[PDB]
Design an enzyme around this catalytic site. Sequence first.
Site, PDB file in Angstrom:
ATOM      1  N   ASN A  53       4.081  -5.627 -12.185  1.00 49.95           N
ATOM      2  CA  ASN A  53       5.533  -5.407 -11.959  1.00 49.95           C
ATOM      3  C   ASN A  53       6.019  -6.593 -11.196  1.00 49.95           C
ATOM      4  OD1 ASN A  53       3.477  -4.717  -9.863  1.00 49.95           O
ATOM      5  ND2 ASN A  53       5.165  -3.333  -8.780  1.00 49.95           N
ATOM      6  N   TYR A  54       5.573  -7.354 -10.370  1.00 49.70           N
ATOM      7  CA  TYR A  54       5.839  -8.712  -9.977  1.00 49.70           C
ATOM      8  C   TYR A  54       4.873  -9.837  -9.881  1.00 49.70           C
ATOM      9  CZ  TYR A  54       9.453  -5.852  -7.977  1.00 49.70           C
ATOM     10  OH  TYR A  54      10.529  -5.021  -7.486  1.00 49.70           O
ATOM     11  N   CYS A  99       5.361  -0.117  -6.091  1.00 52.92           N
ATOM     12  CA  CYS A  99       4.450   0.723  -5.383  1.00 52.92           C
ATOM     13  C   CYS A  99       5.035   1.067  -4.119  1.00 52.92           C
ATOM     14  CB  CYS A  99       2.930  -0.161  -5.237  1.00 52.92           C
ATOM     15  SG  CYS A  99       1.765   0.803  -4.407  1.00 52.92           S
ATOM     16  N   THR A 100       5.749   0.207  -3.425  1.00 46.70           N
ATOM     17  CA  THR A 100       6.504   0.569  -2.249  1.00 46.70           C
ATOM     18  C   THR A 100       8.028   1.204  -2.657  1.00 46.70           C
ATOM     19  OG1 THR A 100       7.261  -0.255  -0.175  1.00 46.70           O
ATOM     20  CG2 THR A 100       7.497  -1.919  -1.944  1.00 46.70           C
ATOM     21  N   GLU A 126      -3.732  -4.671  -1.729  1.00 46.98           N
ATOM     22  CA  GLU A 126      -2.471  -4.056  -1.662  1.00 46.98           C
ATOM     23  C   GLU A 126      -2.583  -2.848  -2.878  1.00 46.98           C
ATOM     24  OE1 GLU A 126       0.575  -6.836  -2.242  1.00 46.98           O
ATOM     25  OE2 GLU A 126       0.817  -7.376   0.087  1.00 46.98           O
ATOM     26  N   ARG A 185       9.211  -3.305   0.883  1.00 49.39           N
ATOM     27  CA  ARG A 185       8.392  -4.625   1.362  1.00 49.39           C
ATOM     28  C   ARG A 185       9.431  -5.201   2.456  1.00 49.39           C
ATOM     29  NH1 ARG A 185       3.332  -6.822  -1.190  1.00 49.39           N
ATOM     30  NH2 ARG A 185       3.658  -8.545   0.176  1.00 49.39           N
ATOM     31  N   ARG A 211      14.053 -14.642  -5.214  1.00 48.79           N
ATOM     32  CA  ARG A 211      13.226 -13.878  -4.064  1.00 48.79           C
ATOM     33  C   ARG A 211      11.802 -15.086  -3.882  1.00 48.79           C
ATOM     34  NH1 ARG A 211      12.962  -7.835  -4.492  1.00 48.79           N
ATOM     35  NH2 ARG A 211      11.263  -8.599  -5.941  1.00 48.79           N
ATOM     36  N   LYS A 243      -4.994 -15.514 -10.533  1.00 52.79           N
ATOM     37  CA  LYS A 243      -5.372 -14.552 -11.896  1.00 52.79           C
ATOM     38  C   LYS A 243      -4.092 -13.904 -12.132  1.00 52.79           C
ATOM     39  CE  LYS A 243      -7.157 -11.925 -14.830  1.00 52.79           C
ATOM     40  NZ  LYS A 243      -6.093 -11.094 -15.057  1.00 52.79           N
ATOM     41  N   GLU A 286      -0.212   9.045  -8.339  1.00 53.01           N
ATOM     42  CA  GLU A 286       1.144   8.152  -8.284  1.00 53.01           C
ATOM     43  C   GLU A 286       1.572   7.966  -9.740  1.00 53.01           C
ATOM     44  OE1 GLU A 286      -0.227   3.924  -7.828  1.00 53.01           O
ATOM     45  OE2 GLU A 286       1.757   3.545  -6.884  1.00 53.01           O
TER      46      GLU A 286
HETATM   47  N1  NAP Z   1       1.192  -2.124  -2.455  1.00 50.38           N
HETATM   48  C1  NAP Z   1       1.549  -3.357  -3.286  1.00 50.38           C
HETATM   49  O1  NAP Z   1       1.904  -4.300  -2.664  1.00 50.38           O
HETATM   50  C2  NAP Z   1       1.793  -3.183  -4.552  1.00 50.38           C
HETATM   51  C3  NAP Z   1       2.826  -3.605  -5.320  1.00 50.38           C
HETATM   52  C4  NAP Z   1       2.929  -3.584  -6.636  1.00 50.38           C
HETATM   53  C5  NAP Z   1       2.108  -2.938  -7.299  1.00 50.38           C
HETATM   54  N2  NAP Z   1       0.968  -2.503  -6.637  1.00 50.38           N
HETATM   55  C6  NAP Z   1       0.180  -1.459  -7.501  1.00 50.38           C
HETATM   56  O2  NAP Z   1      -0.172  -2.459  -8.882  1.00 50.38           O
HETATM   57  C7  NAP Z   1      -0.503  -1.505  -9.831  1.00 50.38           C
HETATM   58  C8  NAP Z   1       0.117  -1.958 -11.034  1.00 50.38           C
HETATM   59  O3  NAP Z   1      -0.501  -3.108 -11.611  1.00 50.38           O
HETATM   60  P1  NAP Z   1      -1.618  -2.982 -12.719  1.00 50.38           P
HETATM   61  O4  NAP Z   1      -1.731  -1.612 -13.035  1.00 50.38           O
HETATM   62  O5  NAP Z   1      -1.247  -4.317 -13.399  1.00 50.38           O
HETATM   63  O6  NAP Z   1      -2.894  -3.377 -11.518  1.00 50.38           O
HETATM   64  P2  NAP Z   1      -4.369  -3.127 -12.113  1.00 50.38           P
HETATM   65  O7  NAP Z   1      -4.461  -2.841 -13.851  1.00 50.38           O
HETATM   66  O8  NAP Z   1      -5.060  -2.136 -11.153  1.00 50.38           O
HETATM   67  O9  NAP Z   1      -5.005  -4.434 -11.724  1.00 50.38           O
HETATM   68  C9  NAP Z   1      -4.125  -5.470 -11.022  1.00 50.38           C
HETATM   69  C10 NAP Z   1      -4.545  -6.733 -11.340  1.00 50.38           C
HETATM   70  O10 NAP Z   1      -5.891  -6.961 -11.475  1.00 50.38           O
HETATM   71  C11 NAP Z   1      -6.371  -7.337 -12.769  1.00 50.38           C
HETATM   72  N3  NAP Z   1      -7.680  -6.711 -12.969  1.00 50.38           N
HETATM   73  C12 NAP Z   1      -7.814  -5.649 -13.782  1.00 50.38           C
HETATM   74  N4  NAP Z   1      -9.096  -4.978 -13.902  1.00 50.38           N
HETATM   75  C13 NAP Z   1      -9.694  -5.916 -13.193  1.00 50.38           C
HETATM   76  C14 NAP Z   1     -11.140  -5.889 -12.434  1.00 50.38           C
HETATM   77  N5  NAP Z   1     -12.153  -4.962 -13.014  1.00 50.38           N
HETATM   78  N6  NAP Z   1     -11.503  -6.940 -11.832  1.00 50.38           N
HETATM   79  C15 NAP Z   1     -10.828  -7.871 -11.315  1.00 50.38           C
HETATM   80  N7  NAP Z   1      -9.482  -7.668 -11.661  1.00 50.38           N
HETATM   81  C16 NAP Z   1      -8.672  -6.883 -12.400  1.00 50.38           C
HETATM   82  C17 NAP Z   1      -5.310  -7.094 -13.468  1.00 50.38           C
HETATM   83  O11 NAP Z   1      -5.342  -7.951 -14.715  1.00 50.38           O
HETATM   84  P3  NAP Z   1      -5.191  -7.311 -16.057  1.00 50.38           P
HETATM   85  O12 NAP Z   1      -4.783  -5.865 -15.890  1.00 50.38           O
HETATM   86  O13 NAP Z   1      -3.892  -7.980 -16.706  1.00 50.38           O
HETATM   87  O14 NAP Z   1      -6.395  -7.588 -16.744  1.00 50.38           O
HETATM   88  C18 NAP Z   1      -4.187  -7.144 -12.721  1.00 50.38           C
HETATM   89  O15 NAP Z   1      -3.692  -8.648 -12.572  1.00 50.38           O
HETATM   90  C19 NAP Z   1       0.106  -0.187  -9.168  1.00 50.38           C
HETATM   91  O16 NAP Z   1      -1.171   0.789  -9.207  1.00 50.38           O
HETATM   92  C20 NAP Z   1       0.661  -0.220  -7.930  1.00 50.38           C
HETATM   93  O17 NAP Z   1       0.317   0.705  -6.967  1.00 50.38           O
HETATM   94  C21 NAP Z   1       0.783  -2.447  -5.375  1.00 50.38           C
END
Ligand code: NAP
Lengths: 474, 474, 472, 474
Positions: free
Chosen positions: C153-154, C283-284, C249, C436, C102, C176, C376
Amino acid sequence: MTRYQNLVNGKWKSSEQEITIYSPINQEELGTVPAMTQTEADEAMQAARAALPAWRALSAIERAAYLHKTAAILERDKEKIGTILAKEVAKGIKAAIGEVVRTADLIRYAAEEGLRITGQAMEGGGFEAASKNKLAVVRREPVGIVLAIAPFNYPVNLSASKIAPALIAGNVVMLKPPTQGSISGLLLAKAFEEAGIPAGVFNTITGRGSEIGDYIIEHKEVNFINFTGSTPIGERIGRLAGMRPIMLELGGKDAALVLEDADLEHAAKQIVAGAFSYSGQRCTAIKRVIVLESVADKLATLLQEEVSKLTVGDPFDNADITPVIDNASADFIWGLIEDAQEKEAQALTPIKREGNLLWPVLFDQVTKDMKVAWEEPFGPVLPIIRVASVEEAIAFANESEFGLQSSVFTNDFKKAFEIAEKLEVGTVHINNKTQRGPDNFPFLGVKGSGAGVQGIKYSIEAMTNVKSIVFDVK
Amino acid sequence: MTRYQNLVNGKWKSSEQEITIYSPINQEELGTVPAMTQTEADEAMQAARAALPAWRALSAIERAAYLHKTAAILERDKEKIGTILAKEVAKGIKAAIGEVVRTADLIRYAAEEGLRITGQAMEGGGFEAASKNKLAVVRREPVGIVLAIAPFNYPVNLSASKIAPALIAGNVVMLKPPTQGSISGLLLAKAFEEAGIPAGVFNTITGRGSEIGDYIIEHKEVNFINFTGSTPIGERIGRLAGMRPIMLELGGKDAALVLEDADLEHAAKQIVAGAFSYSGQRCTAIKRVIVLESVADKLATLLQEEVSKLTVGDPFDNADITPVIDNASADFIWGLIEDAQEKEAQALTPIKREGNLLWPVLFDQVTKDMKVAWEEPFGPVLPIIRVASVEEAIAFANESEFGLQSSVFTNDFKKAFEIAEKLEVGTVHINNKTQRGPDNFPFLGVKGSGAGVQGIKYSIEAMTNVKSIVFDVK
Amino acid sequence: MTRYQNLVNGKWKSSEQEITIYSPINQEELGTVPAMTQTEADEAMQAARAALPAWRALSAIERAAYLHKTAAILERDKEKIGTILAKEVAKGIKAAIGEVVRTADLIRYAAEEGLRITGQAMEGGGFEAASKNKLAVVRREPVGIVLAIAPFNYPVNLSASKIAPALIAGNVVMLKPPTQGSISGLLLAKAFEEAGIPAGVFNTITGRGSEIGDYIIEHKEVNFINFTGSTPIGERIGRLAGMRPIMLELGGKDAALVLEDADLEHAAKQIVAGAFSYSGQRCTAIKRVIVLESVADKLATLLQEEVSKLTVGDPFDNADITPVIDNASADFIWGLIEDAQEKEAQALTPIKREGNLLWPVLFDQVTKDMKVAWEEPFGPVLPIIRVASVEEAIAFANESEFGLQSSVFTNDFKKAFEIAEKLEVGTVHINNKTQRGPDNFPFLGVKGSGAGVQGIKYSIEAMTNVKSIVFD
Amino acid sequence: MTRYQNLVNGKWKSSEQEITIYSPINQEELGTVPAMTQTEADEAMQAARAALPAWRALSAIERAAYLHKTAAILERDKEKIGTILAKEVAKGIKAAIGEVVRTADLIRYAAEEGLRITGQAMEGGGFEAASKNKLAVVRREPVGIVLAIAPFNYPVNLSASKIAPALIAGNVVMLKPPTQGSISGLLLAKAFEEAGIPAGVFNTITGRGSEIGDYIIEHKEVNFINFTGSTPIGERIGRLAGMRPIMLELGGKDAALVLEDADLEHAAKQIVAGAFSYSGQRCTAIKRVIVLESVADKLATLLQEEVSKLTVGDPFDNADITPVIDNASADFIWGLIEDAQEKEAQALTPIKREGNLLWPVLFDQVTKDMKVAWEEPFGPVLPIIRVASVEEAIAFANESEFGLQSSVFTNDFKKAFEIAEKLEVGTVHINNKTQRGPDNFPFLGVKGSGAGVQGIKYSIEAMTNVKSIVFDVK
Ligand SMILES: NC(=O)c1ccc[n+]([C@@H]2O[C@H](COP(=O)([O-])OP(=O)(O)OC[C@H]3O[C@@H](n4cnc5c(N)ncnc54)[C@H](OP(=O)(O)O)[C@@H]3O)[C@@H](O)[C@H]2O)c1
Ligand SMILES: NC(=O)c1ccc[n+]([C@@H]2O[C@H](COP(=O)([O-])OP(=O)(O)OC[C@H]3O[C@@H](n4cnc5c(N)ncnc54)[C@H](OP(=O)(O)O)[C@@H]3O)[C@@H](O)[C@H]2O)c1
Ligand SMILES: NC(=O)c1ccc[n+]([C@@H]2O[C@H](COP(=O)([O-])OP(=O)(O)OC[C@H]3O[C@@H](n4cnc5c(N)ncnc54)[C@H](OP(=O)(O)O)[C@@H]3O)[C@@H](O)[C@H]2O)c1
């Protein structure tokens, strides 16, 4: 020797009657195309009508996969197709291969452009408060069977420019290639069939237009006519189609308005490149030079030397000037040249004829009375007209029976825009030769140079019916 | 008594020959409209061609000011215009005043919609890298003289729906109002002239279409034909126009596909409201009821009682059913009713005729063989057809010679969408009667119900020529 | 063992500090990604700024050729990339390969969609007669350097969904990737470099977001921030970016409004497919079930049996439920489950935990007071809420701190449209699970689920500056 | 004397604290506006949130009726509003009345443009064959409460440019007019309330931005912030808003790149007209002249004589140069002038100050080191910079901390387009002074001159949320 057959219902069919194709270069027999009878045309329309539902029921992306495969096969066989095309329409061999490559690129672009046709979701609340809860979901649906008829000069490119926009939209296509060019149209069909196009989705009808053309134009099943050819035949087709949708790409006597504050060297280079490309046998080509009094002499000198640079000879020697398509076209062009010489036109280049192989003729001091000023010679003749003012230049450009394109050469682009919306043409090129251009650009003529807007987006949209679905949201 | 004159070149002209207009209600002489000769039509075209440059050279907002003033004058004189309109086309007086009000609203919306026609600025870099520096500034320009021809049932609304989209685009308009309706067309011209429209920008041609129609359709100056009328005349016009652009709004035998899971009370209310509004004398009206076996009896009962609710009488008593336009239409509708009775159709409502004043006839058990199932009666007759499956319903709806609109009544909207793109019509209404709707919605027919897409945006865009200007940005 | 390096200025660079990546499946060391320092991030931004002019000066079709070649290489290496991706984010192996496929398709579609961005040629005559001779040629131009930040996750698909729309528009991209997913982001960079992308046009920054994230978010050169992640980090990023354009997002607690006249079997199938796909780690995804009183029991039975059908185990056995990303996420999900059990929630499925490998939990009789109704969980937990009317269903769906998507299950689509514009979400799916979707469809959240509209067309357009040229 | 009150919940409210407004012309007390407390701002947000559902539930046309009535009342009271506006922001009286008229025209255009916002109906079949049956009906929905904050120089026009696009979209508006301009904002509210706008749909918050601004920017209910003002405050607002959508129209140091092949007389006329209109107190105004070496002297002479033509005095004498808004602005402009004089800038015009009434200063020989070359004086000072090549001109134009607009003066428009896409601005005017232009044209700045695209269509669309509804069509 080589028997060619029509793609009908996904299988190759020959006909009892046959047309022999002779190379315009040296009257070499290139092959034989079937002269389909009326009943064979009926069978081909039957096949298209039967294949329409399954084709239209596919996804747009599934439909575009076939067009991408066709483009890949065309790219793969560009050398063979271009060689036969060069032999058949007396086109330069490298120019013919370039035409095959541009055809593949056009098919790819049309396939990727028909994937993105987005409808509308309209609300009635902006027109009246009573209809605030009405939603119209407006979308596009295939017209049905598209009958594409191609001219001789681009039997591959101007066939694909009707097939690919029709096929990606969900229509099935009936291709009528020109008799001098039917071999190249059947090679395009060769590629379309090798790509795996479903049986009946793309069919070809070969035969004389003077005998099979009216029958297939007036046919019951034809839902759309996309025709590129001369104005006399386009008027007849638009008159015979009646109420059915049509596109016409008819003749054009494109002008090159050269003003006083113009780059005469660039203007002359562009005018000669456009005017004498493919022996003047493009319809979107400079066919008139309308130049003011002040710069007329300098422009005439530059134009004459640029025409003198042109190489005249065999298509496989990549000559700039190649033989015209047939003896009748050469006779017509020679008659126009003879009329111009009769009425005291300053022939700026040698006037020699070796049958089909005419030499580029540049005429100066051309008035209204010479037929070369009005009639589309469709050959290597370029009249130069001198006018006293910009108003006379615009008037003379607008007196033509044609409105395809025009080019304005000047340095003040604000004046160029002013002239551009004063010109009764479909496209105005500023400081450039007229051309179909990037095939995403709109291409149209107005005053007997056509009927409809074409170009890949516009041709995809114009071969489809709007369908609105209106329901209540509250 | 009252002499009416044509608006030609901004001044009022009478003709030697004259047509007397008689009220369909009681054969009351309402006035006399000029029967323009061929030379007077030539003079009117002369005036339009002469006034085209100055009209086109105005700003869009200056052009829209005149349309807003016209709409204000129409709103001011709605009572008088509606009274004469009700007398002239036997329309309900309050319905006629409502038509004048909707005409004013349409003129306002078209004026404000033609101000926002935005062109495109295309780049060649997405098609090929050689053309990365080419920019096409694609815009819209007037076609020139638009010839609008209106039908009798809406001689004000369907005249303005061609005039206002044409006028705001920069075109000049030649109005041909119907002979039974020419008085209302000349009152619309009255308002247009009082608004101060420049001389020659809007002209009217009155006279019999059977004698003046072909001359003005085939005229040299006409650059666009916007025609609303019967299919026999629309086919002739599209055949005579040849290559010139046309819009046709032809006949329509709109169907009301009622499925098993449908709200039969709402379906019946909507079907009767659409079918018998203005005595069935709207072209976008339910003219067929295609109902499945299961719900056919209940739907027939509800439809019959709803038709029984209708009031039949004088237009100035605001009767739901008013006299049909003339004796020939009544004779044709009566012939269709007689054929249906011949072939054993269950007449669900009384069948009485008082000359032009026919009474609403609801037919059940209608088969293929009755002419009322196919021919557009254009009157207060509604056949009910019973089919066994949805496939038969779609097939029977698609066997018509018409494709204007259709309505699908069901509760499962996913099935409604499926049927909607299986229906060979221009618009499908889901759980609602067919109508031209909010005049921003697209309005079109396909299979002999028209040629072109209309609606205010679409009619503004389709009465204009695309003009591309291509230059280098480097 | 395997050293991984960042794509900086078209050449591969390692860092002094390093991060070791451990498989969530079995704590297997998968490799090491560089923990870039602040000066290395400065050098990468330098390279992007230097490569911006030549990239922007290319044709759109020349730019799209690189994206097509990248998509071809991704398709070619889908098996290897998907295997490492499955090992790294505990995603199903066949699901991971499907993600790579995809991703290739998204890159192709974005490349072909950025070729057709057409400007406008506006006239002033419709606004005022004095300006009748003015023509504005309105077009789109790159914002400059786009900083794409991806979630775990992706890490391939949601990285490409920011890179390809940015690259085709003429921007240069700074990627990043998430630390748990940085290997897959560097494999996407592997493909982008093999496709021949010009040096500096596409760069990667690896390192902990908690330490390198703020520096690159507040950086001087970054002209656009495309971030996908949690709402707490998205709020901080949108607050630190200040005036610069951003897409966010963020989190989403998507609801599944099931009405009385609904196909409960189809509704249950769709709700379980959306809710527990990738262990609820999309997340979706349906995270709430808001069902009326009448059909609540039947829907609960169907949902519970559908959840009982789910296979729980190893990603390489293509289990429907796989281990959650790390121990902290499992602890958070377990805390939400414990709160729900505390407040008398009817656990309709077994509640078992084997560390990261949690089992799908379906909760019924959920009220406002349980944190699982609001927070969530981002895991295999699906609360079922019962409401008395459609008005209460809409109110409860709108009380969330999130507005990503919602799905309405009913047979009367006119009522479904009514609910759809009453729902404070970005997308409403009628009789279908939230997703999505086709990546041409718009994708957005509103109430703290994001900021901006995305989807291939919308993301291509939103990473560009409008430039009007007005002449006579 | 005259007490002014805020429109809150459709009724007029005074506050305990008050701000006295003094005319910049002669320190004449013009009135008193309420200095709303935090709780009064909470009550106003409460009213807006409560009125949002009923406003959003109206038809677009019902919403536009109120805007049309407001525009009519503004047109009716243009003389009184313009008189008080001229007294309050020291604007020319006839220029102030012209601002009120343009405000009415903007409200009308926004009302008619928000009626035509059409959504999309997308199909998934072009992306993947699995989704061929998915249809997304994408439309626009109000963000909710729009907080509009206006600058002093256009407290009516730049208030309506945020209110009307927000109101027609379905949003409710919270207006924060500038303190020096709050009287004119409350007169705009006067008109909005007289037009019958529903209670709570449009509210005003008056008070010092330094005290009430942060509270209403960080407020819970505000769903969108439309701010026009200085860059220091715009950066703070964009930083405090966090994730919520914002539009910022911040400062701009617009340049006038004059090349060698330029019409220096027209260039000088345009540059002086743009630079010193309203005493240089427009943000979209030429604030730099970047002229090549060859034509610098001639351009400086023409510019200096054009500035010498300017009349300096009272706003009610329609002087070209009027007093600057307050003493602090005059002190800042004087400091920039003093710095330029310090660093040997050739003052081409007299440098005189009478308090707020500064005289137009034209500086030549300006280098990087003078603050007038970089800082936006926001007053009647125009530095002229000389550069050696077009590359240096583009580099110097791009070194600014601002990207609002720029103007390129040259005769070769192909070079003008090249410079135009090399300039890091939002809008490039070719051979014309920079201006917001026709308010349908996009208006934006990039490098700290703003965040977002505005203009009536773009502002209507950007104050709305996209909502996609995806269902199966089968
Ligand atoms: N709506 C959408 O399109 C969508 C789709 C999928 C997932 N999500 C959301 O993604 C989240 C899960 O992903 P995750 O937990 O990996 O995301 P996260 O921990 O909130 O951070 C996302 C990305 O930002 C980086 N990051 C972390 N802290 C940061 C800071 N202080 N400043 C700048 N960048 C920073 C992370 O890198 P590192 O954490 O590796 O350091 C990671 O690559 C869920 O809350 C979900 O709701 C949303
Ligand atoms: N504007 C454009 O896009 C464009 C581009 C290129 C060329 N052209 C025009 O093409 C013309 C040259 O092509 P041509 O001379 O081959 O065209 P043509 O003789 O006018 O006819 C064009 C096509 O129509 C077929 N045809 C002929 N008579 C017909 C009839 N009575 N009914 C239906 N179809 C009929 C022809 O087949 P046969 O003749 O093989 O029987 C041919 O394939 C020039 O006039 C040029 O202006 C226009
Ligand atoms: N690009 C454009 O479209 C455009 C057009 C015109 C003007 N401008 C800019 O407008 C500026 C001049 O206007 P100005 O000096 O009146 O603007 P400003 O002082 O920067 O503030 C603009 C508006 O914001 C309010 N405000 C002040 N401080 C605030 C805070 N801390 N939080 C929230 N709001 C606050 C002000 O109200 P009070 O100051 O009355 O308290 C005023 O109404 C210039 O810098 C010019 O560049 C831009």
